[PDB]
Structure formats: C-alpha cells, structure tokens
Scaffold this active site. Structure first.
Site, PDB file in Angstrom:
ATOM      1  N   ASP A 103      -0.069  -4.210  -3.908  1.00  0.00           N
ATOM      2  CA  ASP A 103      -1.209  -3.284  -3.977  1.00  0.00           C
ATOM      3  C   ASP A 103      -0.737  -1.877  -3.617  1.00  0.00           C
ATOM      4  OD1 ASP A 103      -3.828  -3.793  -4.848  1.00  0.00           O
ATOM      5  OD2 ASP A 103      -4.712  -3.919  -2.847  1.00  0.00           O
ATOM      6  N   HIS A 123      -7.764  -5.214  -0.527  1.00  0.00           N
ATOM      7  CA  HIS A 123      -6.546  -4.534  -0.106  1.00  0.00           C
ATOM      8  C   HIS A 123      -5.808  -5.235   1.048  1.00  0.00           C
ATOM      9  CE1 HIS A 123      -3.845  -1.269  -0.541  1.00  0.00           C
ATOM     10  NE2 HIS A 123      -4.087  -0.669   0.629  1.00  0.00           N
ATOM     11  N   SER A 139       0.844  -1.189   0.000  1.00  0.00           N
ATOM     12  CA  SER A 139       0.000   0.000   0.000  1.00  0.00           C
ATOM     13  C   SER A 139       0.898   1.264   0.000  1.00  0.00           C
ATOM     14  CB  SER A 139      -0.958  -0.057   1.192  1.00  0.00           C
ATOM     15  OG  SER A 139      -2.032   0.862   1.042  1.00  0.00           O
TER      16      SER A 139
HETATM   17 CL   LIG Z   1     -10.288  -3.257  -1.019  1.00  0.00          CL
END
Ligand SMILES: [Cl-]
Ligand SMILES: Cc1ccccc1-c1cc(Nc2nccs2)ccc1C
Ligand SMILES: [Cl-]
EC number: 3.1.1.47
Length: 371
Positions: free
Chosen positions: A242, A297, A219
């Site tokens: 991600d 996520h 992230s």
């Molecule tokens: Cl998500």
C-alpha cells in the site's frame, strides 16, 4: 495477538544500533532461530514510543500513558535474543515502516518472513517520520544508555512536497546503510552494538545469501522501496505494501530496473496514487499489482492485531476482511514473488497464483478507475 509465522523455522528477534548516533543504523532483526524457549519479544519497548504515538494521533501526551497502560506489556511471538539457526545462508529483506510507525510495528510480516528462512532487518528511520526514535549524543551517552529521543515532525502545507521528498531520500540511504551494515557483519567485520544485548552479532558471519536481497515496506515505506531500488542495485526486487507515492521525485519513475510488486488495500488507494504506481510501468520491467478485498491501510501493520473486531473497525485498524486472512494473502503472495525474483529453491511458487490476484479475497490489479 500478533500471529506466529506460518513457516517451518522458529523465529528469533534482536535489536542492532550501529553506530550510536542519529546518522547510524537502527534496526530490529527477525531471523530463523536455533531455539524456541526464549521470552517473547516486547512489542513497544519504551514509554517514549507511546508519547510519540499519541502526538502522531493528535492527542495529549497523557493519552500516551494510557496507551502504555493498555499496550505496554504486549509481546510479539519471536524468541528475544535466541541464537541464529546455523548451517544455512539466508536471503535478506530490508523493511521500511510507514509514517507514525517505527521498527517494531511490522512483526507479523517480519516473523512470518523469518519463519520461511529469511533474515529481516526492519529499519528505524531518523527522518522524523517515525512517531519516536532514539540514538546517543556520543560514546559516553551510549555507554550509560542515556537516550536522546527524536519525535515525529508535523509539516505545514508549504513544506509537504519538499520535506516528504527529503525524507524518502534519507529513508533510502538508511536502507542502503542498513544493508552495508548487515553485509559487513556477514563479511566478519567486528561491530560493537550500541545496545547492550545478549546476542553476539558474530553469529551473523557467513549467514547471508549475499545475492538474495530485497526491500519491502508499507505506505511511506512503500515509497522507500521505490526510491531504494532506483538508488541501490544491490537490492534485486521490491514489494511496496500500500505504497504512499507522494514523497517520490518525478525522476525516480523511469529509474527502477528491478521487479516491483504493489500489494494494495482496497480502501486506502485513490487515483493520484494509482497513476504514480502506473508511472513505474514499462514493457521491459517486471510489474505486478494486487488488491486485498475488504482491506484497510493498516491491515499491513501490527495495529490490526492489537484490538478486537469492533474497536478495530472503529479505529480503522481493521477492514471487512479478517486480519489473519489479509496478512496471510500479503505474506504468501510476497513469498512467491521473492522466490521468483531472488531465485530461491523453496516451495513458495505454491502461491504464484496470488501474484496474479487469483483468490476469492484478491482483486487483480486495482479497483481504482483512473481517467
Ligand atoms: Cl484505509
Ligand atoms: C492500536 C494501538 C496500539 C498501540 C498504540 C496505538 C494504537 C493505535 C494506533 C492507531 N493507528 C496508527 N497507525 C500508525 C501509527 S498509529 C490508531 C489508534 C490507536 C489506538
Ligand atoms: Cl486522487
């Protein structure tokens, strides 16, 4: 339960803080271990991480106390303070956590990497992107374990571009600084851990394959990957899990000579984010992108293993895909990518086809239509 590693090595875990200040390095180390009979590692080691977590989630700090009641004795399957497995130089991953996270929350990844013969340094960032972190005001405070806590910073909309970009740059510096710390310990420099732990750092002397260095993160940490590679050529490749690309300056996109692997969830990604990933592409660059079908996520973080299927799906901690299935894909495709671009002499090329998104639970490239 956080899954045990799939690799042949037993896994040890310890913490290292050096120096003791807000500008020093704090990391959690995952490493191949000699022994497999230690106490399991405590997942969230301090009440203040729970206060931090409940601030990040936008609840009252008393919800932190309930999170602590529910999750405070949870462990992760790594041998706390086990001796490092001798007789072999290990490649090194520096790992960057997401927003609201901290060093301990990606043990499924760290343990799995360690079980395949990696040393993993999961950094704790002091940019106020962690839910909570701590350090010591001075030597006296360090000596008596008088902790100063630093909590997540909430931004006004006007601060977003600027502060996120200041943070990803501190994050990168923290990744280089963590690397230089481990390299010095490898090169025999005596370091006094600010934490009084029963793990002699001297074990790490002559234990790092010094050319085989990668940076991985989730992230915000996936943007840290990219900033780090563009700043520090000691890192030979990176894997952005991600990645949230918003923190990056316009300048970084043409400045990444290293191989770069994007592993995405299906449900997080959006055009603005994919366009920024595509800005990293150039015909002379090694670039790969896969999407895990059914994933969210948080499939990359340990939170995906902390609850049951129904509560998990509700809190958006789990997707339609099984969490073990999704992390195995991400960890195996990572292993194959690392073998290729670090020049490892292991059997990780058995997963080469996952780099291409060739699996029933993989999408090659992205599901996201841009323009
Ligand atoms: Cl998500
Ligand atoms: C599942 C869990 C265990 C222990 C503490 C908090 C949680 C939790 C975590 C999220 N998600 C987050 N993502 C990034 C940071 S926190 C959401 C809800 C809950 C209960
Ligand atoms: Cl968008």
């Amino acid at each position: 339960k956080i899954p045990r590693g799939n690799g042949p090595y037993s896994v040890g875990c310890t913490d290292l803080m050096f120096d003791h200040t807000n500008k020093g390095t704090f990391l959690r180390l995952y490493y191949p271990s000699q022994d497999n009979d230690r106490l399991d590692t405590l997942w969230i080691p301090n009440k203040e991480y729970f206060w931090g977590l409940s601030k990040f989630l936008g609840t009252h700090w008393l919800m932190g106390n309930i999170l602590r009641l529910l999750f405070g004795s949870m462990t992760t399957p790594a041998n706390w303070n086990s001796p490092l497995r001798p007789g072999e130089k290990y490649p090194l991953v520096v790992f960057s956590h997401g927003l609201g996270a901290f060093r301990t929350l990606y043990s499924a990844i760290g343990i799995d990497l360690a079980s395949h013969g990696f040393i993993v340094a999961a950094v704790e960032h002091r940019d106020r992107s962690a839910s909570a972190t701590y350090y010591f005001k001075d030597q006296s405070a360090a000596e008596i374990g008088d902790k100063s806590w630093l909590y997540l910073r909430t931004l006004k909309q006007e601060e977003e571009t600027h502060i996120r970009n200041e943070q990803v740059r501190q994050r990168a510096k923290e990744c280089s600084q963590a690397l230089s710390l481990i390299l010095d310990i490898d090169h025999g420099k005596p370091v006094k851990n600010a934490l009084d732990l029963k793990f002699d750092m001297e074990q790490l002397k002559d234990s790092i394959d010094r050319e085989k260095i990668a940076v991985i993160g989730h992230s915000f940490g996936g943007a840290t990957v990219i900033q780090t590679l563009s700043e520090d050529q000691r890192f030979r490749c990176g894997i952005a899990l991600d990645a949230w690309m918003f923190p990056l300056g316009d300048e970084v996109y043409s400045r990444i000579p290293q191989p770069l692997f994007f592993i995405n969830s299906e449900y997080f990604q959006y055009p603005a984010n994919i366009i920024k990933m595509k800005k990293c592409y150039s015909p002379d660059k090694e670039r790969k992108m896969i999407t895990i079908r059914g994933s969210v996520h948080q499939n990359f973080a340990d939170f995906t293993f902390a609850t049951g299927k129904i509560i998990g799906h509700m809190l958006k901690l789990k997707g339609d895909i099984d969490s073990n299935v999704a992390i195995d894909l991400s960890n195996k495709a990572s292993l194959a990518f690392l073998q290729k671009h670090l020049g490892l002499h292991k059997d990780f090329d058995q997963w080469d086809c996952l780099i291409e998104g060739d699996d029933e639970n993989l999408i090659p490239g992205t599901n996201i239509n841009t323009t």
